[PDB]
Coordinates of all heavy atoms in Angstrom, one line a residue:
Chain N
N46 N -17.4 44.9 -14.8 CA -17.0 45.5 -16.0 C -18.3 45.9 -16.9 O -18.3 46.9 -17.6 CB -16.1 44.6 -16.8 CG -15.3 45.3 -17.9 OD1 -14.7 46.4 -17.6 ND2 -15.2 44.8 -19.1
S47 N -19.3 45.0 -16.8 CA -20.6 45.3 -17.5 C -21.4 46.4 -16.9 O -21.9 47.2 -17.6 CB -21.4 44.0 -17.5 OG -22.5 44.1 -18.3
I48 N -21.5 46.4 -15.5 CA -22.2 47.4 -14.8 C -21.6 48.8 -15.0 O -22.3 49.8 -15.3 CB -22.4 47.1 -13.3 CG1 -23.0 45.8 -13.0 CG2 -23.1 48.3 -12.6 CD1 -24.5 45.7 -13.4
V49 N -20.3 48.9 -14.9 CA -19.5 50.1 -15.1 C -19.7 50.7 -16.5 O -20.0 51.9 -16.7 CB -18.0 50.0 -14.8 CG1 -17.2 51.2 -15.3 CG2 -17.8 49.9 -13.3
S50 N -19.6 49.8 -17.5 CA -19.8 50.2 -18.9 C -21.2 50.7 -19.1 O -21.4 51.7 -19.9 CB -19.5 49.0 -19.8 OG -18.1 48.6 -19.7
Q51 N -22.2 50.0 -18.5 CA -23.6 50.4 -18.6 C -23.9 51.8 -18.0 O -24.7 52.6 -18.5 CB -24.5 49.4 -18.0 CG -24.7 48.1 -18.9 CD -25.6 47.1 -18.2 OE1 -26.8 47.2 -18.1 NE2 -24.9 46.0 -17.7
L52 N -23.2 52.1 -16.9 CA -23.3 53.4 -16.2 C -22.7 54.5 -17.0 O -23.3 55.6 -17.2 CB -22.7 53.3 -14.8 CG -23.4 52.5 -13.7 CD1 -22.5 52.1 -12.6 CD2 -24.6 53.3 -13.2
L53 N -21.5 54.2 -17.6 CA -20.8 55.2 -18.4 C -21.6 55.5 -19.7 O -21.6 56.6 -20.2 CB -19.4 54.7 -18.8 CG -18.3 54.7 -17.7 CD1 -17.0 54.1 -18.3 CD2 -18.0 56.1 -17.1
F54 N -22.2 54.5 -20.3 CA -23.0 54.6 -21.5 C -24.3 55.5 -21.2 O -24.6 56.4 -22.0 CB -23.5 53.2 -22.0 CG -24.6 53.3 -23.0 CD1 -24.4 53.8 -24.3 CD2 -25.9 52.9 -22.6 CE1 -25.4 53.8 -25.2 CE2 -26.9 53.0 -23.6 CZ -26.7 53.4 -24.9
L55 N -24.9 55.2 -20.1 CA -26.2 55.9 -19.7 C -25.9 57.4 -19.4 O -26.8 58.3 -19.6 CB -26.9 55.2 -18.6 CG -27.7 54.0 -18.9 CD1 -28.3 53.4 -17.7 CD2 -28.8 54.2 -19.9
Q56 N -24.7 57.7 -18.8 CA -24.4 59.1 -18.5 C -24.1 59.8 -19.9 O -24.6 60.9 -20.1 CB -23.1 59.2 -17.7 CG -22.6 60.7 -17.6 CD -21.3 60.8 -16.8 OE1 -21.3 61.6 -15.8 NE2 -20.3 60.1 -17.1
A57 N -23.4 59.2 -20.8 CA -23.1 59.7 -22.1 C -24.4 59.9 -23.0 O -24.4 60.8 -23.9 CB -22.1 58.8 -22.8
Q58 N -25.4 59.1 -22.7 CA -26.7 59.3 -23.4 C -27.5 60.5 -22.8 O -28.0 61.3 -23.6 CB -27.6 58.0 -23.3 CG -27.1 56.9 -24.2 CD -27.1 57.3 -25.7 OE1 -26.1 57.5 -26.3 NE2 -28.3 57.3 -26.2
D59 N -27.5 60.6 -21.5 CA -28.2 61.7 -20.8 C -27.6 61.9 -19.4 O -27.8 61.0 -18.6 CB -29.7 61.4 -20.7 CG -30.5 62.6 -20.4 OD1 -30.2 63.3 -19.4 OD2 -31.5 62.9 -21.1
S60 N -26.9 63.0 -19.2 CA -26.3 63.2 -17.9 C -27.2 63.7 -16.8 O -26.8 63.8 -15.6 CB -25.1 64.1 -18.0 OG -25.5 65.4 -18.6
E61 N -28.5 64.0 -17.2 CA -29.4 64.6 -16.2 C -30.4 63.5 -15.6 O -30.7 63.6 -14.5 CB -30.3 65.6 -17.0 CG -29.5 66.6 -17.9 CD -28.3 67.3 -17.2 OE1 -28.6 67.9 -16.2 OE2 -27.2 67.2 -17.7
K62 N -30.8 62.6 -16.5 CA -31.8 61.6 -16.1 C -31.3 60.5 -15.1 O -30.2 60.0 -15.3 CB -32.4 60.9 -17.3 CG -33.4 61.8 -18.2 CD -34.3 60.9 -18.9 CE -35.0 61.7 -20.1 NZ -34.1 61.7 -21.3
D63 N -32.2 60.1 -14.2 CA -31.9 59.1 -13.2 C -31.7 57.7 -13.9 O -32.2 57.4 -14.9 CB -33.1 58.9 -12.3 CG -33.1 60.0 -11.1 OD1 -32.3 60.9 -11.2 OD2 -33.9 59.8 -10.2
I64 N -30.8 56.9 -13.2 CA -30.6 55.5 -13.6 C -31.2 54.6 -12.5 O -31.2 55.0 -11.3 CB -29.0 55.3 -13.8 CG1 -28.5 56.1 -15.0 CG2 -28.7 53.8 -13.9 CD1 -27.0 56.3 -15.0
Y65 N -31.6 53.5 -12.9 CA -32.2 52.5 -12.0 C -31.5 51.2 -11.9 O -31.4 50.5 -12.9 CB -33.7 52.3 -12.4 CG -34.5 53.6 -12.5 CD1 -34.6 54.2 -13.8 CD2 -35.1 54.2 -11.4 CE1 -35.3 55.4 -13.9 CE2 -35.8 55.4 -11.6 CZ -35.9 56.0 -12.8 OH -36.6 57.1 -12.9
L66 N -30.9 51.0 -10.7 CA -30.1 49.8 -10.5 C -30.8 48.8 -9.6 O -31.0 49.1 -8.4 CB -28.7 50.1 -10.0 CG -27.7 49.0 -9.6 CD1 -27.4 48.1 -10.8 CD2 -26.4 49.6 -9.1
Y67 N -31.4 47.7 -10.2 CA -32.0 46.7 -9.4 C -31.0 45.7 -8.9 O -30.1 45.3 -9.7 CB -33.1 46.0 -10.3 CG -34.3 46.8 -10.5 CD1 -34.4 47.8 -11.4 CD2 -35.5 46.6 -9.7 CE1 -35.5 48.6 -11.6 CE2 -36.6 47.3 -9.8 CZ -36.7 48.3 -10.8 OH -37.8 49.1 -11.0
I68 N -31.1 45.3 -7.7 CA -30.1 44.5 -7.0 C -30.7 43.2 -6.4 O -31.5 43.3 -5.5 CB -29.3 45.3 -5.9 CG1 -28.6 46.5 -6.5 CG2 -28.2 44.3 -5.3 CD1 -28.0 47.4 -5.5
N69 N -30.3 42.1 -7.0 CA -30.5 40.8 -6.4 C -29.1 40.1 -6.5 O -28.7 39.5 -7.5 CB -31.5 39.9 -7.2 CG -31.9 38.7 -6.4 OD1 -31.6 38.6 -5.2 ND2 -32.6 37.8 -7.0
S70 N -28.3 40.3 -5.4 CA -27.0 39.8 -5.4 C -26.5 39.3 -4.0 O -26.7 39.9 -3.0 CB -26.0 41.0 -5.8 OG -24.7 40.5 -6.0
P71 N -25.9 38.1 -4.1 CA -25.3 37.5 -2.9 C -23.9 38.1 -2.5 O -23.3 37.8 -1.5 CB -25.1 36.0 -3.3 CG -24.9 36.0 -4.7 CD -25.8 37.2 -5.2
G72 N -23.5 39.1 -3.4 CA -22.2 39.8 -3.1 C -21.1 39.2 -4.0 O -21.3 38.6 -5.0
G73 N -19.8 39.3 -3.5 CA -18.7 38.8 -4.2 C -17.4 39.6 -3.9 O -17.1 40.0 -2.8
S74 N -16.7 39.9 -5.0 CA -15.4 40.6 -4.9 C -15.6 42.0 -4.4 O -16.5 42.8 -4.8 CB -14.7 40.6 -6.3 OG -13.6 41.5 -6.3
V75 N -14.7 42.4 -3.4 CA -14.8 43.7 -2.8 C -14.2 44.8 -3.8 O -14.8 45.9 -3.9 CB -14.0 43.8 -1.4 CG1 -13.9 45.2 -0.9 CG2 -14.6 42.8 -0.4
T76 N -13.2 44.5 -4.5 CA -12.6 45.4 -5.5 C -13.5 45.5 -6.7 O -13.6 46.6 -7.2 CB -11.2 44.9 -5.9 OG1 -11.2 43.6 -6.4 CG2 -10.2 45.0 -4.8
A77 N -14.2 44.5 -7.1 CA -15.2 44.6 -8.1 C -16.4 45.4 -7.7 O -17.0 46.1 -8.5 CB -15.7 43.2 -8.6
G78 N -16.7 45.3 -6.4 CA -17.8 46.1 -5.8 C -17.5 47.5 -5.7 O -18.3 48.4 -6.1
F79 N -16.2 47.8 -5.4 CA -15.7 49.2 -5.3 C -15.7 49.9 -6.7 O -15.9 51.1 -6.8 CB -14.4 49.3 -4.5 CG -14.6 49.6 -3.1 CD1 -14.1 48.7 -2.1 CD2 -15.4 50.7 -2.6 CE1 -14.3 49.0 -0.7 CE2 -15.6 50.9 -1.3 CZ -15.0 50.1 -0.3
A80 N -15.3 49.1 -7.7 CA -15.3 49.6 -9.1 C -16.7 50.2 -9.4 O -16.8 51.3 -10.0 CB -15.0 48.5 -10.0
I81 N -17.8 49.4 -9.1 CA -19.1 49.9 -9.3 C -19.5 51.1 -8.4 O -20.0 52.1 -8.9 CB -20.1 48.7 -9.0 CG1 -19.8 47.5 -10.0 CG2 -21.6 49.2 -9.1 CD1 -20.5 46.2 -9.6
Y82 N -19.2 50.9 -7.1 CA -19.4 52.0 -6.1 C -18.9 53.3 -6.6 O -19.6 54.3 -6.6 CB -18.9 51.6 -4.7 CG -19.0 52.7 -3.7 CD1 -20.1 52.9 -2.9 CD2 -17.9 53.6 -3.5 CE1 -20.2 53.9 -2.0 CE2 -18.0 54.7 -2.6 CZ -19.1 54.8 -1.8 OH -19.2 55.8 -0.9

Side-chain angles (χ1 to χ4, degrees):
Chain N
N46 202 47
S47 184
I48 304 290
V49 164
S50 298
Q51 283 177 76
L52 289 157
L53 289 174
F54 166 73
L55 286 175
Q56 171 181 237
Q58 287 297 105
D59 195 310
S60 58
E61 319 303 308
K62 287 206 199 84
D63 279 11
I64 293 158
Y65 307 93
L66 179 56
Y67 286 82
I68 303 171
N69 193 14
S70 187
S74 171
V75 174
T76 57
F79 269 123
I81 300 167
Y82 174 90

